[PDB]
Amino acid sequence: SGFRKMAFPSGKVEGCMVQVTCGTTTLNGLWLDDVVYCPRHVICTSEDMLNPNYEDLLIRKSNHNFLVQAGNVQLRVIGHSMQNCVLKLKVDTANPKTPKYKFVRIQPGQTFSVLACYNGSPSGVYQCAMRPNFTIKGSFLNGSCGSVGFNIDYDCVSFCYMHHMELPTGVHAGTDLEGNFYGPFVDRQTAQAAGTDTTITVNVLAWLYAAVINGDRWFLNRFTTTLNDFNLVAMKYNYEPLTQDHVDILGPLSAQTGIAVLDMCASLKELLQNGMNGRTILGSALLEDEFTPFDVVRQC
Amino acid sequence: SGFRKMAFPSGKVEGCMVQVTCGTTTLNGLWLDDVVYCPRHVICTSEDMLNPNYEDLLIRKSNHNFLVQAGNVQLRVIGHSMQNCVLKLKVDTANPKTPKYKFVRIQPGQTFSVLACYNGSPSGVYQCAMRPNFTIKGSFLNGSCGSVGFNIDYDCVSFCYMHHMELPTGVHAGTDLEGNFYGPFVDRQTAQAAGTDTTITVNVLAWLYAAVINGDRWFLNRFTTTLNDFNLVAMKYNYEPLTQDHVDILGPLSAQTGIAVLDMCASLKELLQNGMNGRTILGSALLEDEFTPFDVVRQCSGVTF
Ligand SMILES: O=C(Nc1cncc2ccccc12)[C@@H]1CCN(Cc2nnc[nH]2)c2ccc(Cl)cc21
Ligand SMILES: O=C(Nc1cncc2ccccc12)[C@@H]1CCN(Cc2nnc[nH]2)c2ccc(Cl)cc21
Ligand SMILES: [Cl-]
């Protein structure tokens, strides 16, 4: 019993964290096999940063301009290429701690663990969701660039995020491990603003099923709703629309607890209308949206 | 920017997790050097738990009754001894992944990371506080017994907790790595209840400084208070008393933000008597008490491990 925000054990990712230095910039790299992946902005001189031509800047670099450090050992860079917004530094040593891994691009609402690093050294591990506006609400200071987001597929690490930047509101933006940004963001200092964030409705419903499994039932009601009536209400509270895919995904939790999805949907409508009235759900006074249906089933 | 509940990187502890099987019970063990530590209740069946004589049960066991598995390799148990509520299985092979480590007993209010395991396999890592009532509000299913709580000090893992059981309210009880329980709990299937929990006041204050560092200032007020007046108000809302040690510990955060500890206490006093008024602090509608002052400085400064 109990319900916690839980990250994946970070050990397999720690063995991959290295420090990447290019001129005056030092950030983190992900060393997998004989390749170190890191944000391409490591080649910028904070003058290039506003409108950088990364192809032009990388063409002027040589392998000896990149200093890669894995622990107390300097790695030798023997090649450099760019895939979208990620820099790939080919090294002359394969990482012996390379786990079984895969590069996955995730969708909004999906959760993942972040291994926050500074100077190629892991300092903390936490849990995130890809916000509907494609930002992540992380905890990152200067030097965290190159920190990665991942999930563990029972032995295999699926890398889904690399941290690139912090937006003016303190939220974070980055890319998949193929360098493609999540969201309408670019790796430039140009004026960028995240869209208005919304609540991940399917995740809130998943978390309400976690509360029911844990014995919390006070928010349950005798009502059901149509999916369209629920979406009309939920959207007025800045909640994401719930699709038929989401309803289907909540099926196993619906079967486990005996509460139909549209029945739980009516509980959610009521909570949005009334608030909590001094009560908590799973020790929280707000509706939690960073637990997916897959996370709830896994944890419970 | 940002503030998250953050655990220590679990890598050094993952290399120590093994599966311990004794008869029909399977749980986790912590393999450090040539010894595997695990809850002594692994030697018990459903009948023993009602009233077990652990010395009598362990005397009837032989080294071959314990099956220790580190990954896909079976370890050979060459000795067995008991230290309080922990079982120590001496093995023929020293763990090559043994990190620099130390066994430490923590105090209520202190936080630590939990590496939740099942069948000697780590499945999740979460950060939690040792509640003032000595329970932990964990997330554990059957088979999690033997999962450990730790902190990382430079490059040294300080093991502070081993999970033993779940109380009727869903909260958890366990011991330090020397087998001594945290709290008035025993390792037996008996009617046990946790005491009434209280809020870790120093941690709430530390978390209010984290909110100020992150730009959330709405709760700040012009007022200050005496430590005695604050404690009289805090005692009334089931908050732990704040000692001069706590005030001193909050000193660096007080200096960093320009808000004196008793000045922040006056904000906390108002938050207690008046509530949040529909507002949030760090995205939370409740005052968070599972971040110590050291955790806040570490997170808002980037200390690495
Ligand atoms: O923002 C970044 N990384 C950081 C990551 N996480 C959390 C942070 C918290 C405080 C500071 C920096 C943080 C870096 C470096 C700084 N600046 C901003 C900038 N670029 N020139 C002028 N100012 C930019 C701008 C664009 C890009 Cl792609 C990357 C970056
Ligand atoms: O409670 C325990 N451990 C668990 C840990 N974390 C979370 C759990 C969630 C669901 C179930 C079990 C959980 C075990 C096993 C169960 N039983 C009760 C018992 N009664 N007859 C024999 N065993 C007891 C009783 C006492 C002790 Cl010390 C330990 C234990
Ligand atoms: Cl401090």
Curated annotation (Swiss-Prot), chain A:
Domain Peptidase C30 positions: 1-300
Protein activity control: Inhibited by pyridone-containing alpha-ketoamides compounds 13a and 13b. In turn, alpha-ketoamide 13b (tert-butyl (1-((S)-1-(((S)-4-(benzylamino)-3,4-dioxo-1-((S)-2-oxopyrrolidin-3-yl)butan-2-yl)amino)-3-cyclopropyl-1-oxopropan-2-yl)-2-oxo-1,2-dihydropyridin-3-yl)carbamate) inhibits SARS-CoV-2 replication in human lung cells. Inhibited ex vivo by michael acceptor inhibitor N3. Inhibited ex vivo by compound 11a and 11b.
Covalent link location (Glycyl lysine isopeptide (Lys-Gly) (interchain with G-Cter in ubiquitin)): K5, K90
Reactions the enzyme catalyzes: TSAVLQ-|-SGFRK-NH2 and SGVTFQ-|-GKFKK the two peptides corresponding to the two self-cleavage sites of the SARS 3C-like proteinase are the two most reactive peptide substrates. The enzyme exhibits a strong preference for substrates containing Gln at P1 position and Leu at P2 position
Effect of Q189A: Does not affect ability to cleave and inactivate human TRMT1
Top-level taxon of origin: Viruses
Outcome when changing L205V: In strain: Zeta/P.2
Entry's localization field: Host cytoplasm; Host Golgi apparatus; Host nucleus
Enzyme active site: H41 (for 3cl-pro activity), C145 (nucleophile)
Effect of M49A: Does not affect ability to cleave and inactivate human TRMT1
Cytoplasmic side: 1-300
Function: Cleaves the C-terminus of replicase polyprotein at 11 sites. Recognizes substrates containing the core sequence [ILMVF]-Q-|-[SGACN]. Cleaves and inactivates human TRMT1, preventing tRNA guanine(26)-dimethylation of tRNAs. May cleave human NLRP1 in lung epithelial cells, thereby activating the NLRP1 inflammasome pathway. May cleave human GSDMD, triggering alternative GSDME-mediated epithelial cell death upon activation of the NLRP1 inflammasome, which may enhance the release interleukins 1B, 6, 16 and 18. Also able to bind an ADP-ribose-1''-phosphate (ADRP).
Subunit details: 3CL-PRO exists as monomer and homodimer. Only the homodimer shows catalytic activity. Interacts with host FBXO22; this interaction promotes the proteasomal degradation of nsp5.
The protein, known as: 3C-like proteinase nsp5
Taxonomic source organism: Severe acute respiratory syndrome coronavirus 2
Section covered of the full-length record: 3264 to 3563 of 7096
